[PDB]
Amino acid sequence: GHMLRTAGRDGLCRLSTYLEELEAVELKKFKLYLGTATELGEGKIPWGSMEKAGPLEMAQLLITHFGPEEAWRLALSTFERINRKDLWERGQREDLVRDTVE
Numbered sequence: 001g002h003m004l005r006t007a008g009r010d011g012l013c014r015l016s017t018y019l020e021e022l023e024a025v026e027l028k029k030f031k032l033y034l035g036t037a038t039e040l041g042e043g044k045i046p047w048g049s050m051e052k053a054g055p056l057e058m059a060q061l062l063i064t065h066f067g068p069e070e071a072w073r074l075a076l077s078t079f080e081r082i083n084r085k086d087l088w089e090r091g092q093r094e095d096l097v098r099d100t101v102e
Contacts, residue, residue, distance in 0.1 A: 011072060015059045015071050027058060031053070034078055044065040076088055
């Protein structure tokens with residue numbers, strides 16, 4: 001687990017690792033949320049070309065359309081939206097909890 005990446009750079013690697021935790025319907029929510037999103041403007045995802053896509057295909061989908069860490073953002077920030085707040089907290093913690101600490 002640890003000391004695996006002495007020198008490394010993830011992006012897609014972290015994206016996949018979290019998207020592999022999502023089941024078909026979880027990915028379903030995820031890919032419709034951002035893929036058919038009008039809040040995202042037009043939607044960087046092609047027209048239904050993610051229906052037969054799984055964690056592997058999805059990771060390589062977001063990474064190609066959005067970008068390495070943009071894909072990651074699109075996943076973590078959608079985890080919270082599909083009621084996958086658990087894994088979402090595994091993604092973003094950012095900084096500070098209440099006072100002084102964290």
